Amino acid sequence: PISATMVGALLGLGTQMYSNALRKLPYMRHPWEHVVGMGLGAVFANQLVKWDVKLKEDLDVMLAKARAANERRYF
Amino acid sequence: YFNLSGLILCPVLGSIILLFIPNSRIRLIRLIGLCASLITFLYSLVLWIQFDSSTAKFQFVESLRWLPYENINFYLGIDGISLFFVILTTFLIPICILVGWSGMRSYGKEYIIAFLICEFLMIAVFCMLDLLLFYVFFESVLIPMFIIIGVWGSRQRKIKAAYQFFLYTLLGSLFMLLAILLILFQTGTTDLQILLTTEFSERRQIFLWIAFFASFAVKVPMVPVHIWLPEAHVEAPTAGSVILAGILLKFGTYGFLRFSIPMFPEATLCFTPFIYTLSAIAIIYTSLTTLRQIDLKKIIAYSSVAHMNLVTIGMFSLNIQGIGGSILLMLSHGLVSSALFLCVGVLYDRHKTRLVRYYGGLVSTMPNFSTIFFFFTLANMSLPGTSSFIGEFLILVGAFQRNSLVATLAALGMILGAAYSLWLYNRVVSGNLKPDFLHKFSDLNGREVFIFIPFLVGLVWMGVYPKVFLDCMHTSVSNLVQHGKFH
Amino acid sequence: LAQIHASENSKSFEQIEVERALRKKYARKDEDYDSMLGITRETPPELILPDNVLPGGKPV
Amino acid sequence: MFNLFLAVFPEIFIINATFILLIHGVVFSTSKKYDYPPLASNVGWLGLLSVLITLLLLAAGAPLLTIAHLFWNNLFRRDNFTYFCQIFLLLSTAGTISMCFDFFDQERFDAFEFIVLILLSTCGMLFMISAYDLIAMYLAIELQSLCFYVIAASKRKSEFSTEAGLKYLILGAFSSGILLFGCSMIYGSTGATHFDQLAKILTGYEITGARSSGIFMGILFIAVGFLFKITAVPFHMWAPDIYEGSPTPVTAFLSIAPKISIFANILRVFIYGSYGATLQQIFFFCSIASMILGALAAMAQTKVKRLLAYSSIGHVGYICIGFSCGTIEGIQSLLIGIFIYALMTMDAFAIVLALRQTRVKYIADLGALAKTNPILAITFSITMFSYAGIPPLAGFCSKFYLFFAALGCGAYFLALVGVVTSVIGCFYYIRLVKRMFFDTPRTWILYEPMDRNKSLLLAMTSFFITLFLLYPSPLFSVTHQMALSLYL
Amino acid sequence: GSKKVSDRIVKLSAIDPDGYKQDIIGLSGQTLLRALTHTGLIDPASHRLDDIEACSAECEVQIAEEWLEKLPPRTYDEEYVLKRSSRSRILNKHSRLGCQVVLTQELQGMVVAVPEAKPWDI
Amino acid sequence: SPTGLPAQTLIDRYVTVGAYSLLRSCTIEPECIIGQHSILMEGSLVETRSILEAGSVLPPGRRIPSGELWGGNPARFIRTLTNEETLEIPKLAVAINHLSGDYFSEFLPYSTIYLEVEKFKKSLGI
Amino acid sequence: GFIMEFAENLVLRLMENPEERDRKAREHIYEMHERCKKIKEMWALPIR
């Protein structure tokens, strides 16, 4: 399937080539920073997914607390 | 296993690959774009093969979360109604790519990229089963079409036409978005299958139906708002007009079929005379205004308004002959009309003019074009043995069963339709030549001969044996005919 | 005019680097900050052409 | 005793780093050995590093933000809302510093005190978001106000910069006076300045028996001052002039950073200041007028910066739509709109600064940009469409969810005004896109290549804008978590 | 003969603000602001585009009263641009826009007065 | 320049300058084609959308009217360009730009010649 | 041996399973309605 690692790598390579294009430079100007961008994109995508899961868990807990607080009105 | 994910991802890969290719490699860009379009077309054809025609449930369903609480999400699915629309919108793109084959050196990579993004956006429109995301991809088409109209327009008028089209689409879009928001707040979700099982209070049906009609009637121009279509259509490249008439005019009717005719069965019945009145006068007025036009592309563009307003008579009849026969007309119109604009594009590419006065006697210098042009003239005028007659007649028998008067008024459409269709052909093709105006000629090349071949085959195949298409829809259109009915 | 070309085409690697650094350093100026600091940065003689090749002999 | 200060390491670090940078710059700028080096880029890079390090300190120490909360209770309150707001503010400051690097070299802005004042303004805003008292709120507001007053008139020799600085000074001082009078009248009527006390004393008597004149007038004056701060009409007396006359790197920072912190203050005032929905009416009128005036004024603009200022005013009105509807969904829409608007504004100002190197002033100057730089034109068109709110882009999500929040509360009049203003906005936003691609000017202007920092910033923001709809879940999750934490 | 550049040279008398009269050279068919730019009287970086919407009267000029009849009448856009940047919202009734005046061989010897410079950096 | 205009040699956009072309203080308006062995002396203006034939010489102070084809040693008027040619003029410049970009990818940012210099130095000590 | 036999045995393999499709649709309707009810109750929560 489409994992966070591959989409992150594609986004990193794309943003490196996009930065190179915006400066009128060749797309594959410095290959090493293309590799660095792929790695950073993969890392950022994985961290984003890991943070999203925890964020949803925290939101669920906080909504449970809010609903519990609201339910006390009927007593 | 062929699913809706790959069919949508293929144009994405096609557009991304050309995005990072040097523009000096003009050949590679054209080859990769054409290959991507053809692969997408074959993918759609394969999706046709494995399509079950016995269940009303949406097939090849795919889900992707959009909101954190799964309130709204990317729900992709096709049924007997939107399958052929997907096939047509994937088939038209390679033809559009092949149209600009010779002059592609000036357009560049931004042409194929724009058309592939267009194909990506139109495939998802016919596949979305979420009301909100259907709006998101509904109005995402403006940017590629705005760019196509403006950057590669013919004259300086391209700024005015693009502004007018964009403004009309926006004014429809936001008035629809307010209704979508009101539906989301009341019901709770925007899933189509959930919105089709929720009872709407009778007072809210009229307001929501009117708000939906505001956006849809613009893209299926009824009467007050068919003034953007001629200008934006004439001020468009040859392939640009194929997209605007082939597919962009099918959003309004598809939107009516998917989100209006079912979500409000009671509101649809109340507004049936209103739609019959607008469509009857539109057929009479537009088929009559067509006679007094002098531009080649402004006459065929007026042949679509009459045909597309004949479709909305069929949909609102609410029977198998009407709704089922209206689908065949749009597939037929998507092929007949888009083929006519290819014929005009052939004439315009050689001789940079569109006035009918300059054209005449082409039967003696361009005989293959005359033979091909005449065939699509017959299809445009609803001749039996063509795909247009099957849809045209099935709509009439679907509306006569509901109202004899509206079927009578719509029957004069083919009286006037056969008037200008042949009268245009007599002017352009038949007659004497005019060496004072134009004297150098060239008949259809290899591309033009090959491009028209799928239109020729796909027009009589649907015209003599429409049972292949019809039997794939009856299970899906019959569940559409009755939703609130239980007897 | 041949003299400036002769003096430029015969420089060594060390002199070329120094002149490139000086040219980069004095390419753009900021009179406001210099007035704030009480200093006046002047173009080095290595970046000054003789007045006899200017269009009208401009001293300033 | 030392562990009680674990709650202020991010602020202590940034303060000490600003002090070290000031010492370094002042010692080595006035030096004879190095021939008075113009060490503005050095101080800028070290300030960016300091911002990143205090971001690492603040983000990592999430469980420790509530430490010693009783001891720090009277001074500031730190919670989940403050945590995310401060992280976003630091990110925006780092982005602005990254953009402003090329300004110091090509234009030769050698004043290193610019970065020091930016860091001090950042410290003021950090103390602003966590401020939980009228006193601390006002002190932080004044600190950031002076830090901006000084840097608005940085171009001493420029006619526009001095006039813009003077106008910003006078307007901000007047607004601060109005705010302070409101705070004084509230203090004299309730006897309390802490937000907990001021919520307990006002939550009961919801104008049920009588209307307290002092409390009502103080609340109204605070609202008026805050509306001056965000420049929502008719409190936009000199905002376009200030934006135009200010330096472009300066204008970029004032368009993003102050708004986040001021909106945080307005939220932490709404948690207690909801005195019979008095502010909901004021913000209702202000938002309607702001949308209408921005839409009707940005069409008559020929300069890029004035158009950006009026766009900012219009988006402020769109955000205040969320204030008008007081609900969890309303505040969530407000915060989502703030985030998206800040990202789009950073994108647009980076693009403007890219062309600022060739003295871009008018929209017609960027006429043949689609030919000379056919990717910068695409990026600018994407940013303009995101401002307009076209569905496929990220700018549509904020307007969508704000309209949803407005319709939830039952304010149907807000929806129609928003729709009409959106139509007008899209019209004058696609007007700019017409110039780049469709016009054929007789004379062209060629711009020099941009630098690396702004290139990566543009690339990342443009990938965010186009591909936000595919994965918008984290933003909605964090925003809903923030909105709920305002009360519990 | 042949096509000479002198066949479309328009002689003009441009006066800088301190009263000095210098003769400038322009081309028939190009804007008067372009003619003033050649000698350097008006900074080229202030009015790089000879377009009406890309103008805030950086090219404002004072035409003689007897030489204003041999020119196209001021359009609405020219008046609107002139009024806003006047700093007093008044019309001098004899001042034109440099970018909106196209030189012509009938404009031989036209005397034009250039007012003082105005700030345009930001 | 003799004409009195500034003598800066300005070549505008989409201008093709043929080989062995000697330009001195000439100003070439956008979308022009200059033939081979063409000599543009001081203060000569070539108006936009014009083509100068190969081996054509124009004396100082001469002007080529827009939309015309000129040639000959004392350059004379030949004919008037049609619409197709004056719209094809920028396409030639674009094609030559594409060829130049093809040549542009053959060179890395830094040459590797300094290694040969070091080898030569080591062959003689330092 | 003949093209028709292999073609029909391939189409029958490609076509989807009907019972699981209907079961998925029914469970989708159930889960979507339940989530709709919870989301509406979530929206019912007051700001204070």
Ligand SMILES: CCCCCCCCCCC(CCCCCCCCCC)(CO[C@H]1O[C@@H](CO)[C@H](O[C@@H]2O[C@@H](CO)[C@H](O)[C@@H](O)[C@@H]2O)[C@@H](O)[C@@H]1O)CO[C@H]1O[C@@H](CO)[C@H](O[C@@H]2O[C@@H](CO)[C@H](O)[C@@H](O)[C@@H]2O)[C@@H](O)[C@H]1O
């Ligand atoms: C802009 C590009 C658009 C691309 C998006 C569409 C393309 C589809 C790919 C979307 C994609 C990547 C997101 C890319 C981010 C963009 C990069 C940002 C910039 C980078 C430069 C996330 O997509 C999935 O993520 C899930 C969250 O986990 C969510 O499911 C919801 O969650 C619940 C909440 O709790 C909801 O309650 C519930 O309703 C849903 O179940 C959904 O978001 C979705 O299903 C692919 O999934 C990837 O993440 C996870 C799977 O989870 C995988 O690893 C996981 O790690 C542990 C979990 O930490 C698990 O323990 C582990 O078992 C698992 O292996 C990965 O291997 C990969 O599969």
Ligand SMILES: CCCCCCCCCCCCCCCCCCCC(=O)O[C@H](COC(=O)CCCCCCCCCCCCCC)COP(=O)(O)OCCN
């Ligand atoms: C989000 C949507 C998804 C987008 C895709 C994300 C993909 C993940 C990220 C991929 C990034 C790929 C980058 C590859 C590595 C290249 C970095 C090399 C930079 C470098 O060497 O340092 C110098 C410049 O520093 C720099 O250029 C540093 C620039 C940093 C700018 C931003 C700093 C952080 C600001 C906080 C985030 C932005 C705001 C967000 C709210 C180079 O110097 P030189 O040789 O070029 O010459 C002088 C120019 N100065």
Ligand SMILES: [Fe+3]
């Ligand atoms: Fe002007």
